Design a protein around this ligand. Sequence first.
Ligand SMILES: O=C(O)CC[C@@H](NS(=O)(=O)c1ccc(COc2ccc(/C=C3\SC(=O)NC3=O)cc2)cc1)C(=O)O
Length: 435
Amino acid sequence: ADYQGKNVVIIGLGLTGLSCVDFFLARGVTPRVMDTRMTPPGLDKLPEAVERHTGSLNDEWLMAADLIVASPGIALAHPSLSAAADAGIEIVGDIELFCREAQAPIVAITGSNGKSTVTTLVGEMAKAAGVNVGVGGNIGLPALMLLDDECELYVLELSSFQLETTSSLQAVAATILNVTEDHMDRYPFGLQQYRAAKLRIYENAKVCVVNADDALTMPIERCVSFGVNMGDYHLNHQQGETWLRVKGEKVLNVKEMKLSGQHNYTNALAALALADAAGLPRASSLKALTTFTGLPHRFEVVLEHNGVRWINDSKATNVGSTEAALNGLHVDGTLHLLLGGDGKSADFSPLARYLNGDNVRLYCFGRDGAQLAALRPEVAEQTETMEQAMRLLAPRVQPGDMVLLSPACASLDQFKNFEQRGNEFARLAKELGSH
Ligand SMILES: O=C(O)CC[C@@H](NS(=O)(=O)c1ccc(COc2ccc(/C=C3\SC(=O)NC3=O)cc2)cc1)C(=O)O
């Protein structure tokens, strides 16, 4: 594509919006920027000669544009944006701009849970093979900051939102890892509309990788599959140990992995299937599986002291993700579970199954605290903030217990993002968790 002379409007700042600004400027196009927030992050790092409008959308600017670049954080359904679309004004996102320029194969990963782990993993597989790889998208750097002529492979985490505005992706290997309820505040046509957005990732992909255990990950020549008991990539359980297997051949005893748990093992399978489709050597891909330590805020033990494990799973920002943490979870004594924040209109009831017995306590906070507490009121306390919940639970903690921040919600009602929320839990854990 050629943008010269075009009237360009970027909706949304932050890192991503700033990368879009720099993208256009470096191509000799001065965009204008709008953001519905009065002081969006990065405002102060915006260059002085870029026109900006904050606090709302400017329909004069939008209806004047030749191209609208919408941040994933604004709904295409927003009245101002659908007015523009009705006018035949072209609307894209950062990812779409990336895909038009990228000069290396792209491995594209989406999913309600696991997508950051799989993306990171595939990145580490490439790195183990000596491949110059750019890893990012919806994590790490925004995609436009990855763009580099010497890159030999890109591995992009993509959200449903990014996919809605992307049309030029032709992934060398693409996956939806799973589809469980999330973002319903952005999908008024419910689960199928959310699913429909993620399905876009498969269009023109050279290989598709689907989850044989989640029918919703399949499109409406076949896809490669991964699964627990079925799928081209699957698990084989022999006698307390577990193997990764490709079409009946053993490829890795999971005792060599530093990650644990069925769902991490199916993440490994997904990563391997993607790495294989991308043409990465198998040996170095397996080697990456054994060195990978996991991501911060992803079921991350921040403190083990005095018989108590404090676990930061702050990246659990949906129900499926918390359920992943709770399902099969071994706790010696009492589980003290922190739930709360912005539940994005999710049904929390699927969590109820995991909260029976004498060994669970709930500490529910933020915007949907009352709804979370209502899962089992008898064993629940509700506060306003996570710090209050931590100071409430800490005196109760006994040798053998677990403290688990796995909130099933976004942090955005009270925090900058789930990282700040994990960081704050980590600091509090260390204060509250020794004498
Ligand atoms: O961190 C959390 O606790 C939750 C993350 C959570 N992720 S996520 O909503 O999928 C998400 C998507 C893109 C980004 C980064 O990029 C953005 C730029 C601008 C905006 C807000 C804008 S733009 C505008 O014009 N008016 C706005 O209020 C939001 C995001 C951050 C989060 C979620 O999964 O619930």
